[PDB]
Amino acid sequence: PIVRVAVLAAGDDGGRLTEMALPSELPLREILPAVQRIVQPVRLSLAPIGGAPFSLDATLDTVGVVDGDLLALQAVPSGPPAPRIVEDIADAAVIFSEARRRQWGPTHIARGAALALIGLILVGTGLSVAHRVITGDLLGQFIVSGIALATVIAALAVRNRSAVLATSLAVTALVPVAAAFALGVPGDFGAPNVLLAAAGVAAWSLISMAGSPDDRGIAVFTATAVTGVGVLLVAGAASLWVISSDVIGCALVLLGLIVTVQAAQLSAMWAVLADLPRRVRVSQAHQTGVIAAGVLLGVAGSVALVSSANASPWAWYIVVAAAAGAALRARVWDSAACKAWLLGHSYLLAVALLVAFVIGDRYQAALWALAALAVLVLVWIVAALNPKIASPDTYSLPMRRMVGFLATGLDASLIPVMALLVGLFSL
Amino acid sequence: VRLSLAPIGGAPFSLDATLDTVGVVDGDLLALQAVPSGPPAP
Amino acid sequence: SRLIFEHQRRLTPPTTRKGTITIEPPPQLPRMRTEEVDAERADYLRYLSVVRDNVRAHAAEQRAALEWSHPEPEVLATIPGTRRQWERDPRDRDFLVLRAGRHDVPLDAALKVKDTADEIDLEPVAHSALRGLLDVQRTVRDAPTGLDVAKLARITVIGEADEARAAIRAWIAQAVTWHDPTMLGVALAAPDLESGDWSWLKWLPHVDVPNEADGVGPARYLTTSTAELRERLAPALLKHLLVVLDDPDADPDDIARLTGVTVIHRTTELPNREQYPDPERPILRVADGRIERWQVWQPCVDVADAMSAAEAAHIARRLSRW
């Protein structure tokens, strides 16, 4: 009754990995001496990678070894930690408090200054625009451009000196920049201004994604870039050709689902094997952002279709259909943040309608909108208690299949509906 | 079948050599499992 | 059969400076501006704080030593094979001492308060802090300690079945591993020997006499009858000897009353007003996890040890190679 397992002993230098086959149905205390001679004042034992050491009395059967798992060679757990004892209550405050990482140090000040700065820029911008939107005077556009230009330089100025402040200072640079261009030829907050801005951030972003020396700040750039580009076209074509009473979003939700359904390929579009780990995450970061572009777009017009009153009964089903489609399109996405993004599409959209009615003075659908959130929250909870309805393993295969034709049967089955709202084929 | 003795975690003994040539000291653990019709698994 | 072993030099165990630290006495309350004594209280306590962190260092030495030579009854599996197995010789300060458990040791450092306690009126806050130092700190916390068998000459045991034995099965192992088996020889006599009980204590070249055969084992003193084991050591009556028994009844203390045989037996009854437990011939009831010495109830071990036969047998075999 032998079983083939592989142990791992790494205490001396790097590590030594061999495998073997071992006689089951015994107290591990008998076979421990053998392995100690192959691979190699304390006592040792065997443990699965990720678990606690196995008792010296159980057998490799009753402790549940499958023939081919990778055991490690760890130590018997511990003894007591031998608690210290100090009687003078005075020194009982200085002694038992060191274990904090409390020292002020000239690095709590580094994080200090930058965090102060990012606040200065933000409210520095918002003041001038508030000096510009609720009243009118262009002195702001002097100050907007002043700070907007300044931060532009600083990120380019510490690209190779901090390597973390840099990428942080870039992401905040686009708040005043998007504010600056949005101020040329104002209008009433303007029709074509939103065209000028989508050029700006899409400009500023693309310059910096390639400007990042490493990870940690890539995904936020990628997502807003495609978001800028995406809104640019459907704003440009909206600036001259089409009057588009309501069909800006009909372009968006179309463009939205298009980006979400076609997501894996777009990530690949941005593309010794030693630098594989660096390449694999950036690839993942690219995907996780790109999907956010989808959801944020998916609502971007969807928040405008059912926005005002007097909407269409086909308009109400034009958004709901999209939501479910994206919600059931998650089961294909592996990572965690990838899942959450599309999963909470309905959540994000739910609140949008609420504020819309409260700011639109409706006090009718507002309450409903709040009742349309609980239903979505309630299902989240029952998904959390028992890992049963969340786990598709305790299902049926045609159920796993039916959800398929269910999925592709609706996420695309709205383009005929789309032709109704605008009435594209009523002409 | 062909059962024979073996130190734990090693290939079984060679049937026609005494244990004293392979180096069995008084107090080992030996297993009655089959004989390899092949390699001794280094 | 058995491979040979050589006599190395025992690795020098971590030292133990057995100093006698001398604390300086406090002030005497003149009865003078308040800000004056406030300048001295802050001058004494600031002195005791540098001595409280100096006398706390000594402790971590003894607990480093005492633990260096009496590891828990699982480390002693890896002792025999390695190069430090029978390190102890007949002159170490830890010679013939048997780890029975772990509790509070009295910190052999002296802690003398060389002063003149005359017309007591000492400054209150600067005085209470002194006593507080002297009581809490003059005792190490949980430290492996145990029996000094070299001059004990009698053992008695009182407890239930699977526990009164496991204590002997516990420390007779630590008794022998820390010596070259040429120096100590045990003697066992048990009716229930070969049922997972004392039987495993056969394999050992500590369980050997000089020049006997008995068929399979070197000596195989492991038997049932007490007069059987006993006279198989009639010649052995300076190597040291541990005659032991598992019989609740049947006459202990029938050999002595020697110079190296400490006898042992298990019973079930405790005495009522036993006269003055000697520094020798102790009585050690074994509660759930304690080893309470009979006195008048003097725990004498705050958490005992128990050597299960499974990790026990595995001790013999490994020691049967050399």
Residue C208 contacts B, CB cutoff 8 Å = no
**Per residue in A42-61, is it b (16+ CB within 10 Å) or e — as a string?**
ebbbbbbeeeebbebeebbe
Across-strand partners of C285? C158, C292
- Quick one: C83 exposed, middle or buried, by C-beta within 10 A (0-12, 13-18, 19+)? exposed
Name the residue among A408, A316, A329 with its Cα closest to residue A368: A316
Nearest residue of chain A to residue B29 (CA atoms): A30
- The rounded distance, in Å, linking the Cα atoms of C261 and A179 is 96
Q: From residue B3, how far is each of A258, B34, B36 by CA, in Å? A: 67, 4, 10
Name the residue among C288, C307, C299, C322 with its Cα closest to residue C174: C307
- The rounded distance, in Å, linking the Cα atoms of C87 and C7 is 8
Name the residue among C319, C311, C316 with its Cα closest to residue C74: C311
Across-strand partners of C140? C105
Task: Identify the three-state secondary structure at position C104.
Answer: strand
- The rounded distance, in Å, linking the Cα atoms of A407 and A129 is 45
Name the residue among A257, A384, A398 with its Cα closest to residue A328: A257
With a CB cutoff of 8 Å and minimum separation 6, the contacts of A402 are none
Three-state SS for B1-42 is CCEECCECCCCCCCCCCCHHHHCCCCCCCECCEECCCCCCCC
Residues of C in contact with A83 (CB under 8 A): 141
Residues of A in contact with B33 (CB under 8 A): 2, 23
Alpha carbon of C132: minimum distance to chain A alpha carbons (Å)? 7
The pairing of strands A2-9 and A16-23 is: antiparallel
C-beta atoms of A23 and B8 within 8 A: yes
In the 8-state DSSP scheme, what is residue A212?
-
In the 8-state DSSP scheme, what is residue C193?
T
Backbone angles phi, psi at A54, to 5 degrees: -85, 145
Q: How many Cβ pairs closer than 8 A exist between chain A and C?
A: 44
In the 8-state DSSP scheme, what is residue A55?
P
Residues of A in contact with C79 (CB under 8 A): 41
- The rounded distance, in Å, linking the Cα atoms of C113 and C124 is 17
Nearest residue of chain A to residue C52 (CA atoms): A86
Task: Identify the three-state secondary structure at position C76.
Answer: helix
Residues of C in contact with A80 (CB under 8 A): 142
Q: Are A58 and A28 in contact, with CB atoms under 8 Å apart?
A: yes
Backbone angles phi, psi at C188, to 5 degrees: -125, 140
Name the residue among C285, C245, C247 with its Cα closest to residue C261: C245
The pairing of strands C157-158 and C184-189 is: unpaired
In the 8-state DSSP scheme, what is residue C4?
-
Name the residue among C290, C260, C261, C294 with its Cα closest to residue C278: C294
Q: Count the Cβ atoms, other than its own, within 10 Å of residue C181.
A: 19
Three-state SS for C133-172 is HHHHCCCEEEEEEEECHHHCCCCCEECCHHHHHHHHHHHH
Half-sphere exposure of C213 (CA within 13 A, CB side): 1
- Quick one: C284 exposed, middle or buried, by C-beta within 10 A (0-12, 13-18, 19+)? buried
- The rounded distance, in Å, linking the Cα atoms of C322 and C316 is 11
In the 8-state DSSP scheme, what is residue C103?
E
Best of A86, A89, A96 to disrupt the C interface (most C CBs within 10 Å) is A86
Backbone angles phi, psi at A382, to 5 degrees: -60, -15
C-beta atoms of C203 and B25 within 8 A: no
Residues of B in contact with C320 (CB under 8 A): 26-27
Ordered DSSP codes for A363-425:
-SHHHHHHHHHHHHHHHHHHHHHSTTTS-GGGS-HHHHHHHHHHHHTTSSTTHHHHHHHTTTT
C-beta atoms of A2 and B33 within 8 A: yes
Q: Are A225 and A202 in contact, with CB atoms under 8 Å apart?
A: yes
Q: Count the Cβ atoms, other than its own, within 10 Å of residue C236.
A: 14
Residues of B in contact with C1 (CB under 8 A): 25-26
- Quick one: A218 exposed, middle or buried, by C-beta within 10 A (0-12, 13-18, 19+)? buried
Ordered DSSP codes for C258-300:
--SB----EES---SS-S---SSS--EEE-SS-EEE------S
Best of A73, A89, A91 to disrupt the C interface (most C CBs within 10 Å) is A91
The pairing of strands C140-147 and C98-105 is: antiparallel
Nearest residue of chain B to residue C2 (CA atoms): B26
Q: How many Cβ pairs closer than 8 A exist between chain B and C?
A: 14
The amino acid at residue A268 is A
Across-strand partners of A225? none
Ordered DSSP codes for C212-261:
---SSSSS---BS-HHHHHHTTTTT---EEEEEE--SSS-SS-S----SB
Which contiguous run of DSSP H or E holds residue A5? strand A2-9
Would you say how long chain B is, in residues? 42
Q: From residue A12, how far is each of A20, A38, A71 by CA, in Å? A: 21, 14, 18
Residue A83 contacts C, CB cutoff 8 Å = yes
Nearest residue of chain A to residue C317 (CA atoms): A30
Q: Are C104 and C197 in contact, with CB atoms under 8 Å apart?
A: no
Name the residue among C182, C237, C222, C187 with its Cα closest to residue C205: C182
- Structure-determination approach: cryo-EM
- The rounded distance, in Å, linking the Cα atoms of A362 and A355 is 10
Residue C320 contacts B, CB cutoff 8 Å = yes
- The rounded distance, in Å, linking the Cα atoms of C175 and C154 is 15
With a CB cutoff of 8 Å and minimum separation 6, the contacts of C318 are A33, B27, C77, C80, C81
The pairing of strands C140-147 and A16-23 is: unpaired
With a CB cutoff of 8 Å and minimum separation 6, the contacts of A181 are A193, A196, A197, A199, A200
CATH architecture of A2-75: Roll (3.10)
- Quick one: C312 exposed, middle or buried, by C-beta within 10 A (0-12, 13-18, 19+)? buried
With a CB cutoff of 8 Å and minimum separation 6, the contacts of C29 are C121, C122, C123
Q: Are A14 and A35 in contact, with CB atoms under 8 Å apart?
A: no
Residues of C in contact with B29 (CB under 8 A): 317
Residues of B in contact with A34 (CB under 8 A): 7-9, 29
Backbone angles phi, psi at C231, to 5 degrees: -80, -10
Which contiguous run of DSSP H or E holds residue C185? strand C184-189
In the 8-state DSSP scheme, what is residue A149?
H
User: Which residue in the block uniquely carries the two structure tokens 């995904």?
Assistant: A219
Half-sphere exposure of C22 (CA within 13 A, CB side): 3
Q: What sign does the CA torsion over C314, C316, C318, C320 have?
A: negative
- The rounded distance, in Å, linking the Cα atoms of A261 and B33 is 58
- The rounded distance, in Å, linking the Cα atoms of A3 and A68 is 8
Chains in contact with chain C (at least 3 beta-carbon pairs closer than 8 A)? A, B
With a CB cutoff of 8 Å and minimum separation 6, the contacts of C242 are C149, C172, C175, C184, C185, C186, C187, C261, C262, C264
C-beta atoms of A21 and B33 within 8 A: no
Name the residue among C158, C157, C97, C155 with its Cα closest to residue C278: C155
Alpha carbon of C23: minimum distance to chain A alpha carbons (Å)? 17
Q: Are A226 and A256 in contact, with CB atoms under 8 Å apart?
A: no
In the 8-state DSSP scheme, what is residue A207?
H
User: Which residue in the block uniquely carries the two structure tokens 């999907």?
Assistant: A291
C-beta atoms of B26 and C320 within 8 A: yes
Name the residue among C301, C258, C320, C268 with its Cα closest to residue C98: C301
Q: Are A326 and A342 in contact, with CB atoms under 8 Å apart?
A: yes
- The rounded distance, in Å, linking the Cα atoms of A183 and A140 is 10
Residue A43 contacts C, CB cutoff 8 Å = yes
Alpha carbon of B8: minimum distance to chain A alpha carbons (Å)? 7
